Homo-oligomer: 165 residues x 2
């Protein structure tokens, strides 16, 4: 019943903005026993799939988001050794590697320190991390024309993309 939750909050244009996406996801109960999603997290979700640069999301893109969310949640449940509903530093760093990222120790530490609350990473931040990593990497890859692991950005292009995400 993915469509039921989506259509219940979509605007007359048949799309959801971040606030409506938050409402849709919350009503769907996809987070299960974990924390519900925050508006910021949903804003990053919109950015991740915002190919039209509109701040909105149609159902086809939502379907893609839904499947990705299903996947990241499973990964969370997998690395969440204990039940708790929150993961420890080591488990987050592990999850990131599990998703295919090869980040330096310093970078992983930066990510951990931004989200850590009493040494734990809550579900909303875990997902925000997954979505933001993907969106920033997609954005970066498009400017890495020679496929070298480097990119040269013009200020206005850099600011547009990073402010959006």
């Amino acid at each position: 019943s993915v469509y039921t939750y989506f259509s219940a909050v979509a605007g007359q244009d048949g799309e959801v903005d971040a606030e409506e996406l938050q409402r849709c996801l919350t009503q769907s109960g996809i987070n299960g026993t974990y924390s519900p999603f925050s508006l910021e997290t949903c804003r990053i979700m919109i950015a991740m799939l915002d190919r039209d640069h509109t701040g909105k999301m149609g159902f086809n893109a939502f379907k893609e988001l839904w499947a990705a969310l299903n996947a990241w949640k499973e990964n969370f449940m997998t690395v969440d050794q204990d039940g708790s509903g929150t993961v420890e530093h080591h488990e987050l760093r592990q999850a990131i590697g599990l998703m295919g990222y090869r980040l330096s120790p310093q970078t992983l530490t930066t990510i951990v320190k931004r989200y850590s609350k009493n040494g734990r990473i809550f579900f909303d931040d875990y997902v925000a991390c997954c979505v933001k990593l993907r969106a920033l990497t997609d954005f970066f890859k498009k400017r890495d024309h020679l496929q070298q692991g480097s990119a040269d950005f013009i200020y206005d292009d850099f600011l547009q993309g990073t402010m959006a995400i």
Copy 2:
């Protein structure tokens, strides 16, 4: 009594993490009638002044933040709980940012709700614009308005902010 609010929530290390900063600012009343700052906004505030990379902020940095916050708040209260699309663009330009029409629209579209911008979002925008520009400026050695980023460095800076 800025220090009073700060020290009331600061940790054993004399610094505040994002959650403590959120509490500090709320208890300080800087928010007034407007809606309190979100955890995300406070996280960007820390990132903006996180020179030693710890995800925490000491009082000296907080003093700088407090001054900036008060200034952006005045603009919000005197450049008009929300503002409109036309006014946000205005504020961005006034802060010295000369961006393209598309870039300004993209920024406005991320926060816009029913055509309005809430106080928390207005400030988040101000803080993020400053953090990102500082980060970018540091890689623009020739000051050409362009900057190289090695993937890992790019991710570290943008995930922190």
